[PDB]
Amino acid sequence: RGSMALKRIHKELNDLARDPPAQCSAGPVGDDMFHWQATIMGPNDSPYQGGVFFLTIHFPTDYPFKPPKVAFTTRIYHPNINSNGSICLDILRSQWSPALTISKVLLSICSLLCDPNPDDPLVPEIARIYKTDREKYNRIAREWTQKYAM
């Protein structure tokens, strides 16, 4: 909160609107600027193609000096995202910089969907299938996009 965070959050939203991310949405849920929602459409040639994924974003009271809290509300079959929707991404913690923006964060997540990090698994078994039988990985990933993201 405080003046500085609110001003930076709103500055981020204006830049995001003036340069609409490719089929990815993000903005405040209602009138509290520290509470955002993002919608991500599955990449075109990924097993997530066709699905729509919703996330919750919570800016810390000291933003940009603290990272935002991001999580999936939509179920997804992925090695770096568990059942609580928790996202295992470095920039969301240790590789966090005040020079980063939510726009960069969304992009970083989009990439995560396209290229998982099986070496840093949040879900062991999904990491395994991915590494040892990627065709199956894609079939199951495609299946969950049907049951949960459409």
PDB file of C-alpha atoms in Angstrom:
ATOM      1  CA  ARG A   1       0.000   0.000   0.000  1.00  0.00           C
ATOM      2  CA  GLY A   2       1.166   3.467   0.730  1.00  0.00           C
ATOM      3  CA  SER A   3       1.387   5.971  -2.053  1.00  0.00           C
ATOM      4  CA  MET A   4       4.331   4.447  -3.908  1.00  0.00           C
ATOM      5  CA  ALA A   5       2.911   0.933  -4.451  1.00  0.00           C
ATOM      6  CA  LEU A   6      -0.535   2.163  -5.552  1.00  0.00           C
ATOM      7  CA  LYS A   7       1.073   4.562  -8.037  1.00  0.00           C
ATOM      8  CA  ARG A   8       3.316   1.854  -9.449  1.00  0.00           C
ATOM      9  CA  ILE A   9       0.480  -0.680  -9.719  1.00  0.00           C
ATOM     10  CA  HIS A  10      -1.656   1.813 -11.651  1.00  0.00           C
ATOM     11  CA  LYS A  11       1.321   2.703 -13.853  1.00  0.00           C
ATOM     12  CA  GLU A  12       1.685  -1.008 -14.637  1.00  0.00           C
ATOM     13  CA  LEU A  13      -1.957  -1.324 -15.596  1.00  0.00           C
ATOM     14  CA  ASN A  14      -1.786   1.623 -17.981  1.00  0.00           C
ATOM     15  CA  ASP A  15       1.224   0.176 -19.782  1.00  0.00           C
ATOM     16  CA  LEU A  16      -0.433  -3.214 -19.963  1.00  0.00           C
ATOM     17  CA  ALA A  17      -3.568  -1.675 -21.497  1.00  0.00           C
ATOM     18  CA  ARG A  18      -1.645   0.435 -23.987  1.00  0.00           C
ATOM     19  CA  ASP A  19       0.203  -2.663 -25.139  1.00  0.00           C
ATOM     20  CA  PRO A  20      -2.432  -5.469 -24.783  1.00  0.00           C
ATOM     21  CA  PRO A  21      -0.585  -8.738 -24.111  1.00  0.00           C
ATOM     22  CA  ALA A  22      -1.340 -11.413 -26.699  1.00  0.00           C
ATOM     23  CA  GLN A  23      -4.566 -13.096 -25.529  1.00  0.00           C
ATOM     24  CA  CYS A  24      -3.701 -12.693 -21.874  1.00  0.00           C
ATOM     25  CA  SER A  25      -5.754 -10.564 -19.544  1.00  0.00           C
ATOM     26  CA  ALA A  26      -4.949  -8.981 -16.167  1.00  0.00           C
ATOM     27  CA  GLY A  27      -6.461  -6.207 -14.093  1.00  0.00           C
ATOM     28  CA  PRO A  28      -7.994  -5.471 -10.676  1.00  0.00           C
ATOM     29  CA  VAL A  29     -11.014  -7.492  -9.490  1.00  0.00           C
ATOM     30  CA  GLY A  30     -13.379  -4.702  -8.493  1.00  0.00           C
ATOM     31  CA  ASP A  31     -12.095  -1.537  -6.834  1.00  0.00           C
ATOM     32  CA  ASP A  32      -9.121  -2.746  -4.824  1.00  0.00           C
ATOM     33  CA  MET A  33      -5.969  -2.142  -6.909  1.00  0.00           C
ATOM     34  CA  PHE A  34      -3.937  -4.605  -4.782  1.00  0.00           C
ATOM     35  CA  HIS A  35      -6.190  -7.462  -5.906  1.00  0.00           C
ATOM     36  CA  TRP A  36      -5.938  -8.540  -9.570  1.00  0.00           C
ATOM     37  CA  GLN A  37      -7.169 -11.353 -11.752  1.00  0.00           C
ATOM     38  CA  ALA A  38      -5.520 -12.686 -14.881  1.00  0.00           C
ATOM     39  CA  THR A  39      -6.810 -14.953 -17.617  1.00  0.00           C
ATOM     40  CA  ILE A  40      -4.383 -16.959 -19.743  1.00  0.00           C
ATOM     41  CA  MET A  41      -5.394 -18.740 -22.932  1.00  0.00           C
ATOM     42  CA  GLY A  42      -3.441 -21.949 -23.587  1.00  0.00           C
ATOM     43  CA  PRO A  43      -0.587 -21.564 -26.143  1.00  0.00           C
ATOM     44  CA  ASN A  44      -1.604 -22.567 -29.681  1.00  0.00           C
ATOM     45  CA  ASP A  45       0.586 -25.617 -30.170  1.00  0.00           C
ATOM     46  CA  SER A  46       0.825 -26.672 -26.548  1.00  0.00           C
ATOM     47  CA  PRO A  47      -1.434 -29.371 -25.026  1.00  0.00           C
ATOM     48  CA  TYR A  48      -3.161 -26.421 -23.326  1.00  0.00           C
ATOM     49  CA  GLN A  49      -4.432 -25.049 -26.633  1.00  0.00           C
ATOM     50  CA  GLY A  50      -8.123 -24.202 -26.249  1.00  0.00           C
ATOM     51  CA  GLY A  51      -8.111 -23.783 -22.493  1.00  0.00           C
ATOM     52  CA  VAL A  52      -8.613 -20.641 -20.448  1.00  0.00           C
ATOM     53  CA  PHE A  53      -6.670 -20.359 -17.191  1.00  0.00           C
ATOM     54  CA  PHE A  54      -7.545 -17.939 -14.390  1.00  0.00           C
ATOM     55  CA  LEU A  55      -5.075 -16.622 -11.818  1.00  0.00           C
ATOM     56  CA  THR A  56      -5.291 -14.445  -8.716  1.00  0.00           C
ATOM     57  CA  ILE A  57      -2.747 -11.682  -8.129  1.00  0.00           C
ATOM     58  CA  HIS A  58      -2.094  -9.904  -4.843  1.00  0.00           C
ATOM     59  CA  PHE A  59       0.302  -7.008  -4.671  1.00  0.00           C
ATOM     60  CA  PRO A  60       2.267  -6.700  -1.406  1.00  0.00           C
ATOM     61  CA  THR A  61       1.761  -3.564   0.658  1.00  0.00           C
ATOM     62  CA  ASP A  62       5.335  -2.599  -0.268  1.00  0.00           C
ATOM     63  CA  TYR A  63       5.257  -3.317  -3.999  1.00  0.00           C
ATOM     64  CA  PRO A  64       7.584  -3.203  -6.124  1.00  0.00           C
ATOM     65  CA  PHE A  65      10.023  -4.006  -3.314  1.00  0.00           C
ATOM     66  CA  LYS A  66       8.160  -7.242  -2.733  1.00  0.00           C
ATOM     67  CA  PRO A  67       6.885  -9.706  -5.385  1.00  0.00           C
ATOM     68  CA  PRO A  68       3.156 -10.118  -6.077  1.00  0.00           C
ATOM     69  CA  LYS A  69       1.423 -13.287  -4.885  1.00  0.00           C
ATOM     70  CA  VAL A  70       0.278 -15.243  -7.968  1.00  0.00           C
ATOM     71  CA  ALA A  71      -1.699 -18.503  -8.114  1.00  0.00           C
ATOM     72  CA  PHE A  72      -3.779 -20.565 -10.522  1.00  0.00           C
ATOM     73  CA  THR A  73      -7.473 -20.885  -9.759  1.00  0.00           C
ATOM     74  CA  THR A  74      -7.951 -23.206 -12.736  1.00  0.00           C
ATOM     75  CA  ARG A  75      -6.728 -26.819 -12.462  1.00  0.00           C
ATOM     76  CA  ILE A  76      -3.864 -27.638 -14.805  1.00  0.00           C
ATOM     77  CA  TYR A  77      -1.649 -30.652 -15.451  1.00  0.00           C
ATOM     78  CA  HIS A  78       1.869 -29.259 -15.111  1.00  0.00           C
ATOM     79  CA  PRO A  79       5.091 -30.167 -13.232  1.00  0.00           C
ATOM     80  CA  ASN A  80       5.660 -26.704 -11.693  1.00  0.00           C
ATOM     81  CA  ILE A  81       2.081 -26.041 -10.511  1.00  0.00           C
ATOM     82  CA  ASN A  82       0.466 -28.160  -7.771  1.00  0.00           C
ATOM     83  CA  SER A  83      -3.154 -28.831  -6.844  1.00  0.00           C
ATOM     84  CA  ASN A  84      -3.343 -25.648  -4.752  1.00  0.00           C
ATOM     85  CA  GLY A  85      -2.486 -23.802  -7.950  1.00  0.00           C
ATOM     86  CA  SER A  86       0.829 -22.711  -6.432  1.00  0.00           C
ATOM     87  CA  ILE A  87       3.389 -21.618  -9.053  1.00  0.00           C
ATOM     88  CA  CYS A  88       7.055 -22.641  -8.681  1.00  0.00           C
ATOM     89  CA  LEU A  89       8.749 -19.764 -10.560  1.00  0.00           C
ATOM     90  CA  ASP A  90      11.968 -18.089  -9.393  1.00  0.00           C
ATOM     91  CA  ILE A  91      11.066 -14.506 -10.301  1.00  0.00           C
ATOM     92  CA  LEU A  92       8.058 -14.855  -8.005  1.00  0.00           C
ATOM     93  CA  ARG A  93      10.528 -15.175  -5.103  1.00  0.00           C
ATOM     94  CA  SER A  94      14.325 -15.107  -5.204  1.00  0.00           C
ATOM     95  CA  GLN A  95      14.793 -13.890  -8.805  1.00  0.00           C
ATOM     96  CA  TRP A  96      12.365 -11.019  -8.022  1.00  0.00           C
ATOM     97  CA  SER A  97      13.380  -7.490  -8.994  1.00  0.00           C
ATOM     98  CA  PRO A  98      11.560  -4.186  -8.450  1.00  0.00           C
ATOM     99  CA  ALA A  99      12.396  -3.696 -12.153  1.00  0.00           C
ATOM    100  CA  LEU A 100       9.949  -6.460 -13.057  1.00  0.00           C
ATOM    101  CA  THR A 101       6.259  -5.906 -13.775  1.00  0.00           C
ATOM    102  CA  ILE A 102       3.120  -7.985 -13.775  1.00  0.00           C
ATOM    103  CA  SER A 103       3.277  -7.910 -17.562  1.00  0.00           C
ATOM    104  CA  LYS A 104       6.676  -9.577 -17.427  1.00  0.00           C
ATOM    105  CA  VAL A 105       5.336 -12.035 -14.853  1.00  0.00           C
ATOM    106  CA  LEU A 106       2.442 -13.127 -17.071  1.00  0.00           C
ATOM    107  CA  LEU A 107       4.842 -13.655 -19.937  1.00  0.00           C
ATOM    108  CA  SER A 108       7.070 -15.707 -17.622  1.00  0.00           C
ATOM    109  CA  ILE A 109       4.115 -17.884 -16.695  1.00  0.00           C
ATOM    110  CA  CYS A 110       2.985 -18.263 -20.340  1.00  0.00           C
ATOM    111  CA  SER A 111       6.477 -19.554 -21.097  1.00  0.00           C
ATOM    112  CA  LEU A 112       6.222 -21.935 -18.139  1.00  0.00           C
ATOM    113  CA  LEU A 113       3.141 -23.477 -19.797  1.00  0.00           C
ATOM    114  CA  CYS A 114       5.058 -23.872 -23.058  1.00  0.00           C
ATOM    115  CA  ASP A 115       8.301 -25.045 -21.496  1.00  0.00           C
ATOM    116  CA  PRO A 116       8.109 -26.579 -18.000  1.00  0.00           C
ATOM    117  CA  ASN A 117      11.093 -27.006 -15.649  1.00  0.00           C
ATOM    118  CA  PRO A 118      11.014 -30.762 -14.893  1.00  0.00           C
ATOM    119  CA  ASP A 119      14.209 -30.435 -12.881  1.00  0.00           C
ATOM    120  CA  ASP A 120      12.478 -28.187 -10.300  1.00  0.00           C
ATOM    121  CA  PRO A 121       9.219 -30.158  -9.893  1.00  0.00           C
ATOM    122  CA  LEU A 122       6.351 -29.089  -7.673  1.00  0.00           C
ATOM    123  CA  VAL A 123       4.606 -32.362  -8.616  1.00  0.00           C
ATOM    124  CA  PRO A 124       7.103 -35.291  -8.818  1.00  0.00           C
ATOM    125  CA  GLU A 125       5.034 -37.663 -10.946  1.00  0.00           C
ATOM    126  CA  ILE A 126       4.147 -35.042 -13.526  1.00  0.00           C
ATOM    127  CA  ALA A 127       7.843 -34.140 -13.731  1.00  0.00           C
ATOM    128  CA  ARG A 128       8.643 -37.805 -14.286  1.00  0.00           C
ATOM    129  CA  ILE A 129       6.099 -38.505 -17.075  1.00  0.00           C
ATOM    130  CA  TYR A 130       7.237 -35.325 -18.774  1.00  0.00           C
ATOM    131  CA  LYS A 131      10.875 -36.380 -18.761  1.00  0.00           C
ATOM    132  CA  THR A 132      10.379 -40.029 -19.639  1.00  0.00           C
ATOM    133  CA  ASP A 133       7.192 -40.072 -21.753  1.00  0.00           C
ATOM    134  CA  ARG A 134       6.350 -36.677 -23.185  1.00  0.00           C
ATOM    135  CA  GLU A 135       3.719 -37.984 -25.581  1.00  0.00           C
ATOM    136  CA  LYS A 136       1.713 -39.269 -22.628  1.00  0.00           C
ATOM    137  CA  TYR A 137       2.408 -36.030 -20.771  1.00  0.00           C
ATOM    138  CA  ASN A 138       0.783 -34.107 -23.623  1.00  0.00           C
ATOM    139  CA  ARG A 139      -2.214 -36.493 -23.767  1.00  0.00           C
ATOM    140  CA  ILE A 140      -2.998 -36.117 -20.076  1.00  0.00           C
ATOM    141  CA  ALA A 141      -2.232 -32.363 -20.249  1.00  0.00           C
ATOM    142  CA  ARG A 142      -4.700 -32.127 -23.145  1.00  0.00           C
ATOM    143  CA  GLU A 143      -7.234 -34.182 -21.165  1.00  0.00           C
ATOM    144  CA  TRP A 144      -7.174 -31.848 -18.118  1.00  0.00           C
ATOM    145  CA  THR A 145      -7.521 -28.870 -20.456  1.00  0.00           C
ATOM    146  CA  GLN A 146     -10.810 -30.496 -21.434  1.00  0.00           C
ATOM    147  CA  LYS A 147     -12.123 -31.299 -17.950  1.00  0.00           C
ATOM    148  CA  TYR A 148     -10.995 -28.064 -16.332  1.00  0.00           C
ATOM    149  CA  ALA A 149     -10.055 -25.295 -18.780  1.00  0.00           C
ATOM    150  CA  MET A 150     -12.913 -25.312 -21.270  1.00  0.00           C
TER     151      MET A 150
END
